[PDB]
Design a protein around this ligand. Structure first.
Ligand SMILES: Nc1ncnc2c1ncn2[C@@H]1O[C@H](COP(=O)(O)OP(=O)(O)O)[C@@H](O)[C@H]1O
Ligand SMILES: [Mg+2]
Ligand SMILES: [Zn+2]
Ligand SMILES: [Zn+2]
Lengths: 273, 590
DNA sequence: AAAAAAAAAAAAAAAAAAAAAAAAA
DNA sequence: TTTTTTTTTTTTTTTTTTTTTTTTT
């Protein structure tokens, strides 16, 4: 389906968006196996049975059955992965209509990505792409609760405000409340807000892989709401994620250069043991 | 729209040079070099300044005296040179890397008169910060009128548009690494601390410099700002980085072989087939040190080393041999250490009490430009895959000796400091020089008593060399003759069969070999170890244990590596056994 | 009794978390 | 007038050096 001007903009359009949506649904339904008839059938069955709200998807089979979608995947991971989540949600509901009461969302994890790089080989060219690396977890914070669907509370008229979905790039700023049209301070409403687990880890190059006259490099990664606790310090892990850059990271502060910090939005974690 | 006519003319001439310059063969060499510019991870073309001088002298002079104000135009010329030939991405950018600048300048010479113009300097890399994406020109949105101010050029500072004309996904980024260097020893003026100016590296040449390397940086000195105040700091922006003293004129054995030239490989292969290469290397590496053949052989085997291995259970078999030298003063111990340091690359020399724990193993600081932390490499780390020469070892504090013991034990340093943990690798051999307790070696005691080293430290020293100053007249006459001949004829009087550069190249090539151990060699090792244990059945300077079998295996491996052999013949085992047996000295007593 | 090694004091530097004020529009 | 970025201040901790103390010949 190579056509247009920009890959991310190409998926942005509603047309190809729905085309990919239905093609991925048909791939989930139809891709069976060499012999393991409809691997995704029992996959979804087990995930719903244990309430795992996740789906590990091999890249090899997805590329084989739908090469266009696999090609589009790494270029613009955010949009393709969101579409895959949307597709898998209704696929699960079709298989398990009652499971809709559980998490109202499904995450898609991608594994066995073909090209695997090293933390020292990361460059600006890899910005905003699905990338697979390997490393040792050198630090990992607690399971911090991050805002997911905030409902700020207007102080003046005590009216709770609608769900302002939290973005991993920018902090959500409420407008003026619809009722009393006040742009006041507002405060979170924890009782009515819903959150998501937020863990932050650091992944460093395996010492056995570093060269002689070089030091190991490290990159910060964010695990979100299902990959949390999947790692502990000292683990050798293969991490596939988005080399995200545009959240707030830009050393605009004085005595600073226009550098950009980088964090890997984790999408799949595999402990090698 | 005023046009910088000088810059435009420079661009035109540079493009003409790019599309016209021909090599000796007569082909457009830079066209061939650009052929590879299409592939991603490749956006820099290295252009030798000698070629630029040869083609258009006036253009070269203009570039040298106006490097900064024309560099963007040179990049544009390269982009035009490549675009019209192939189908490179439109948004992809390209950079011009210069090298072989005939003249070099000292860090002390970087006066303001050199700002914004081409120059090459030499320095020693102290530490390299991580690699980041850098914004050169992107997009800006006005929050007052939503008028998008587009492609505002950042000058080493977050520069919003100064006035409204009335994002990331649509911006161009370049790799950026701030690596700190410092002045070389030769350039240091009398009684002055070294100068450090943080050089800045960009795409392609963004990791060509590592901590501890001697590197030549070619580029431009620039000023960075650190009613408003104009506080400026000098900073070097390098378009290319190369080793100051290249090892090869042209990592696996074949890769190193191809890295070399034809003549270098001829030399290396010739010396590999050179019978008696052992003695030739010993003499050439230490021409001014009389006698002490055993110590020379030990340090040579140390420079080569053994073969590291990993056990099925994960246990690590040490494959790098350490050496210690103990004896009376003026036995040329510190001279051995200095020889090894000055000769071997990645060789770091220290003192007894002059180094603290952090500066001797590692330290952590926080990157001044991002949220990540960088690791200041201590002396042990700079010796990674090299050698660390610790003179006056016995004087070293215990708080540091524990770290050295850790490095010898597991080859690694574990740090938990300043908000970051890390397990870093230190594959270093240790050449120690320790004075005997009381300042003189007493022959009527075991080695354990003659020195103030803790038992764990001595345990993992493969070789101990004792240099007693027997007051023999023949030896004194020989030593005096050699020293006086040295001081009479300074430059000459040293006829070393192989130049230090040749030995460096041969060492780098041979280090890649991983000799095996044949069954015959295994049986020979077993018999030799049996005999060496029977030796301890008069008393020796120190007991003989299985660690001596490990040392013998490692020494045989190093001996095999010396001749670039692929299997450890029995002769290597015999030589290692003989050397280790000589290292053991009888504890004579009335 | 005097020297060598260890421990504690103490002073300077860094992180940082939060409250208040001055400058900007 | 109202925001915002800085300014401070107020705690706390950390690291280097020096000094003081303890153990051994
Ligand atoms: N066998 C020898 N051959 C040549 N020079 C020697 C020899 N022994 C001692 N010297 C000279 O004695 C000087 C002092 O030796 P040095 O290594 O400082 O003693 P130490 O080992 O106590 O530090 C050196 O400069 C060295 O040139
Ligand atoms: Mg000495
Ligand atoms: Zn309101
Ligand atoms: Zn405006």
């Amino acid at each position: 389906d190579l056509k247009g001007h920009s890959v991310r903009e190409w998926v942005s359009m509603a047309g190809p968006r729905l085309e990919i949506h239905h093609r991925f649904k048909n791939f989930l339904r139809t891709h069976v196996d060499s012999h393991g008839h409809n691997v995704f059938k029992e996959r979804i069955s087990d995930m719903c049975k244990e309430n795992r709200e996740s789906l590990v998807v091999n890249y090899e089979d997805l590329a084989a059955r739908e090469h266009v979608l696999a090609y589009f995947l790494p270029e613009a991971p955010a949009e393709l992965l969101q579409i895959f989540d949307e597709a898998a949600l209704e696929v699960v509901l079709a298989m398990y209509p009652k499971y809709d009461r559980i998490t109202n969302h499904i995450h898609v994890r991608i594994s066995h990505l073909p090209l695997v790089e090293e933390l020292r080989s990361l460059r600006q060219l890899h910005l905003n792409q699905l990338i697979r690396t390997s490393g040792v977890v050198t630090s990992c914070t607690g399971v911090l609760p991050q805002l997911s669907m905030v409902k700020y509370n207007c102080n003046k008229c005590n009216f709770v405000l609608g769900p302002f979905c939290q973005s991993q790039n920018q902090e959500v700023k409420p407008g003026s409340c619809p009722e009393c049209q006040s742009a006041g301070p507002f405060e979170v409403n924890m009782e009515e807000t819903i959150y998501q687990n937020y863990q932050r880890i650091r992944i460093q190059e395996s010492p056995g892989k570093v060269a002689a006259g070089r030091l190991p490099r490290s990159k910060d990664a964010i695990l979100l709401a299902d990959l949390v606790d999947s790692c502990k310090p000292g683990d050798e892990i293969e991490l596939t994620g988005i080399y995200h850059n545009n959240y707030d990271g830009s050393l605009n502060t004085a005595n600073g250069f226009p550098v950009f910090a980088t964090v890997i939005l984790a999408n799949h974690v595999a402990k090698k043991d | 729209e005023v046009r910088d006519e000088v810059a435009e003319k420079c661009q035109k001439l540079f493009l003409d040079f790019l599309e016209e310059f021909q090599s000796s063969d007569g082909e457009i060499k830079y066209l061939q070099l650009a052929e590879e510019l299409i592939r991603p991870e490749r956006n820099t073309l290295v252009v030798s300044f000698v070629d630029l001088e040869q083609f258009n002298q006036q253009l070269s002079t203009t570039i040298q005296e106006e490097f900064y104000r024309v560099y963007p135009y040179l990049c544009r010329a390269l982009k035009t040179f490549v675009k019209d030939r192939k189908e490179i991405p439109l948004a992809k950018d390209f950079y011009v890397a210069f090298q072989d600048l005939p003249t070099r300048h000292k860090i002390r010479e970087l006066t303001s008169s050199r700002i914004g113009l081409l120059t090459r300097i030499s320095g020693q890399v102290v530490r390299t910060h991580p690699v980041h994406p850098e914004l050169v020109s992107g997009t800006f949105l006005c929050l007052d009128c939503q008028t998008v101010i587009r492609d505002v050029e950042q000058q080493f500072k977050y520069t919003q548009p100064n006035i409204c004309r009335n994002d990331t996904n649509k911006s161009r980024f370049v790799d950026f690494q701030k690596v700190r260097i410092q002045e070389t020893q030769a350039e240091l003026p009398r009684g002055s601390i070294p100068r450090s100016l943080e050089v800045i590296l960009r795409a392609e040449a963004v990791e060509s410099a590592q901590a501890g390397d001697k590197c030549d940086f070619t580029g431009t000195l620039i000023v960075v700002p650190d009613v408003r105040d104009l506080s400026y700091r000098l900073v070097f922006l390098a378009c290319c980085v190369a080793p100051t003293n290249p090892r090869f004129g042209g990592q696996t054995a074949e890769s190193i072989k191809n890295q070399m030239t034809v003549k270098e490989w001829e030399k290396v292969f010739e010396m590999s087939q050179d019978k008696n290469l052992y003695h030739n290397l010993c003499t050439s590496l230490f021409p001014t040190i009389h006698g002490n053949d055993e110590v020379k052989r030990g340090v040579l085997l140390m420079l080569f080393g053994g073969v590291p291995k990993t056990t099925g259970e994960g246990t690590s078999l040490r494959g790098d041999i350490n050496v210690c030298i103990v004896g009376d003063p003026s036995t040329a111990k510190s001279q051995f250490l200095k020889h090894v340091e000055e000769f071997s690359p990645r060789a770091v020399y220290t003192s007894g009490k002059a180094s603290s724990a952090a500066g001797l193993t590692a330290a952590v600081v926080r990157d001044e430009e991002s949220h990540e932390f960088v690791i200041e490499a201590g002396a042990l780390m700079l010796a990674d895959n090299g050698v660390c020469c610790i003179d006056e070892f016995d004087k070293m504090d215990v708080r540091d000796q524990v770290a050295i013991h850790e490095a010898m034990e597991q080859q690694t340093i574990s740090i938990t400091k300043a908000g970051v943990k890390a397990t870093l690798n230190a594959r270093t051999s240790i050449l120690a020089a320790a004075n005997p307790i009381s300042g003189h070696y007493d022959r009527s005691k075991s080695l354990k008593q003659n020195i103030n080293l803790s038992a764990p430290i001595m345990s993992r020293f493969d070789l101990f060399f004792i240099l007693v100053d027997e007051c023999n007249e023949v030896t004194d006459y020989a030593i005096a003759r050699r020293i006086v001949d040295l001081h009479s004829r300074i430059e000459e009087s040293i006829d070393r069969v192989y130049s230090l550069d040749d030995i460096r190249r041969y060492l780098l090539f041979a280090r890649q070999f991983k000799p095996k151990i044949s069954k015959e060699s295994e049986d020979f090792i077993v018999e030799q170890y049996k005999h060496l244990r029977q030796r301890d059945g008069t008393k020796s300077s120190w007991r003989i244990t299985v660690r001596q079998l490990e040392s013998m295996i490692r020494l045989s491996e190093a001996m095999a590596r010396m001749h670039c052999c692929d299997e450890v013949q029995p002769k290597h085992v015999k030589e290692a056994f003989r050397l280790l047996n000589k290292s053991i000295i009888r504890v004579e007593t009335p």
